Amino acid sequence: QSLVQLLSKLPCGEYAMFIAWLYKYSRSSKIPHRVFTLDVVLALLELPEREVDNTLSLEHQKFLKHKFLVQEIMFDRCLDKAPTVRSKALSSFAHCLELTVTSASESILELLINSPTRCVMAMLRRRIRDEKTNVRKSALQVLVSILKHCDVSGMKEDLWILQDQCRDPAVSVRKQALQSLTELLMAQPRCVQIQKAWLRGVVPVVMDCESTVQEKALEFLDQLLLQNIRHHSHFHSGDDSQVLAWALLTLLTTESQELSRYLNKAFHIWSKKEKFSPTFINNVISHTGTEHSAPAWMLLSKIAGSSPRLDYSRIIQSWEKISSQQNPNSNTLGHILCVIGHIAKHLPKSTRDKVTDAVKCKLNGFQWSLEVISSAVDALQRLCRASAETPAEEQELLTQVCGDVLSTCEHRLSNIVLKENGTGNMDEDLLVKYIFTLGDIAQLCPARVEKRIFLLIQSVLASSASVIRAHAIITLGKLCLQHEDLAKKSIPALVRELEVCEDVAVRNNVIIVMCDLCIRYTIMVDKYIPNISMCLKDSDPFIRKQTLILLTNLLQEEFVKWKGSLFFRFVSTLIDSHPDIASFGEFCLAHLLLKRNPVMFFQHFIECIFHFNNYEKHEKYNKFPQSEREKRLFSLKGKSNKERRMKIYKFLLEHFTDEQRFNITSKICLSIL
Amino acid sequence: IIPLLPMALVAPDEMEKNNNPLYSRQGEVLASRKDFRMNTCVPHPRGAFMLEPEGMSPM
């Protein structure tokens, strides 16, 4: 303040030579002197541009320009060699750039960020890799200060980079980037791709280990979506909070739907917190008349299930209208069926009878996709549960209701499959959905399946030597989940079909089936675990990543006692050519296996060394059996294989801690040597 | 650093599993419908089933 007043007292020439001396003094190596000089350069930049003195020299006239000042000083200040100096330099840079924004000197911004070929995207890419967090905080602040006045057209990749800094694992980085994106979406309301990248950024925030930034995301989405839309009579296009929330759920339809699981977790928090309201029910019922109700209906998929206390007749009428209609959106009808199932405890039988009759007639219609069939059959399980209040009563009612469509589709399969079949005399989709309907029925009546059905689907299996065959194996698995005798009869044929058949999709389905039989019958399919271990070496990477997901689900519950061969497979799968699947493997072990138990690699290291060395004569260990097929799959040895050996070894070293490193150095220098 | 988490690595809610239980031939309830992953299988036009439709489809 005193300098500013004295500079107002100072003439332009005295100011000019004094800026010359201060620019020379900026090259002094004193760190607090440099900090003070850059701070008072920022103080000078708080003032507007000094009046142009044509009597002064060219070196003095160039001091007057603020563009030349920010080109000379803070270009070197942001590119210094000290972290705190660069931190304060970037803070002063953000302050001076918002100062140029308030002085409306956008040409300075274009000259720095997009100079005609020093690139500010490049130095920002440097700043986000800096160790210091507040350097990245100043960097995100200055890159969100820019482009609030300009369109994103041509530079949506900068926004893509912005949710890449939302990825940065610091509390303050997300804790300020979330506020930055929320003020971005209200800076301009009308850009679809900004909202798309926004929702892609914000839906993995709430899975963080830290709880407060998760909650700040939760109520920020509450004020963005829950606290925007009003009653439909109150709703107006001018009320753009409602319009923005409607557009945001319009972007929730067919774009990203895994986030509904995060929404289920969030509503689980608000079910613990009981933050759902009957006023919200009144608002969504008021918006049932709108055509925007379909994402509101899938929001109601679990929200309405908490406490059904109201009248839902208009919803039943709309469901009847779209069920009489033959080609709706499948998601809309499925969500309407699940909300009907969730409110069925309050609904009377006087509507439930005609609902079940309409279901029965349209099931005889067979006018749906298979996802709608699955939603319908679980919803009809809900309708039988709400119909009955006795286990015997729901048993008998579900038995007869499933028996009707069971005998119907059983008669259809006897007319088609048991009779002669041409190459193109059938529609594949009709028969596949018929078998899927019978599989859902046999899921819902395990007591009503007979040995004639067993030999029928065994004859279907006998028509092997494709698309229908894998689904037949899936339905066979659903049945043998309930039938251990059919499981024992089937598993040599299933194991044979695993290592004989050639289509990738049917073997994927066989592995999925027999691993859910592993979840049911671990005590018996523990001997068939090494079939999974040899199937881990597939040609197709999608098969390998799917088996990685299955083995991750097996390891997270810890179904089986831990054997060294399983650990050998966990190590051996990490040399995938595709890096994403392998990195999923290291992320899974780092966030889950290291969390569950830290000492597994400590005992497993020495037998891992022996396993990759083809050494079997150890006195203490190497007692596991081996097959010829896995012997020729495990090309793990030699000069052609040493690189992945010490790559894996140093990965395990960085997994080991310093105390673990000391103890493992003691163990290797005693026992092995 | 931290990538996207696979959605199948999260256990479902308990009340949902109460809402869809699976019973036996004797009629006693043995498990729930959400305890098994073929309910979460997603169809393909070739007839394949995947847990994650988001990602690279096989050729």
From Swiss-Prot, chain A:
Start and stop residues of the HEAT repeats: 66-100, 118-150, 157-188, 522-558
Protein name, per record: Condensin-2 complex subunit D3
Domain of life: Eukaryota
Pathological condition linked to this protein in its record: Microcephaly 22, primary, autosomal recessive: A form of microcephaly, a disease defined as a head circumference more than 3 standard deviations below the age, sex and ethnically matched mean. Brain weight is markedly reduced and the cerebral cortex is disproportionately small.
Gene name tied to this protein: NCAPD3
Subcellular locations according to the entry: Nucleus
Subunit structure: Component of the condensin-2 complex, which contains the SMC2 and SMC4 heterodimer, and 3 non SMC subunits that probably regulate the complex: NCAPH2, NCAPD3 and NCAPG2. Interacts with BRD4 (isoform B), leading to insulate chromatin from DNA damage response pathway.
Purpose: Regulatory subunit of the condensin-2 complex, a complex which establishes mitotic chromosome architecture and is involved in physical rigidity of the chromatid axis. May promote the resolution of double-strand DNA catenanes (intertwines) between sister chromatids. Condensin-mediated compaction likely increases tension in catenated sister chromatids, providing directionality for type II topoisomerase-mediated strand exchanges toward chromatid decatenation. Specifically required for decatenation of centromeric ultrafine DNA bridges during anaphase.
Sites of Phosphoserine modification: S145
UniProtKB/Swiss-Prot annotation, chain B:
Protein name listed in UniProt: Condensin-2 complex subunit H2
Residues bearing the modification Phosphoserine: S57
Entire protein: shown range: 144 to 202 of 605
Lineage, broadest ranks: Eukaryota, Metazoa, Chordata, Craniata, Vertebrata
Quaternary structure and partners: Component of the condensin-2 complex, which contains the SMC2 and SMC4 heterodimer, and three non SMC subunits, NCAPG2, NCAPH2 and NCAPD3 that probably regulate the complex.
UniProt record similarity statement: Belongs to the CND2 H2 (condensin-2 subunit 2) family.
Function according to Swiss-Prot or TrEMBL: Regulatory subunit of the condensin-2 complex, a complex that seems to provide chromosomes with an additional level of organization and rigidity and in establishing mitotic chromosome architecture. May promote the resolution of double-strand DNA catenanes (intertwines) between sister chromatids. Condensin-mediated compaction likely increases tension in catenated sister chromatids, providing directionality for type II topoisomerase-mediated strand exchanges toward chromatid decatenation. Required for decatenation of chromatin bridges at anaphase.
Location(s), subcellular: Nucleus; Chromosome
Species per Swiss-Prot/TrEMBL record: Homo sapiens (Human)
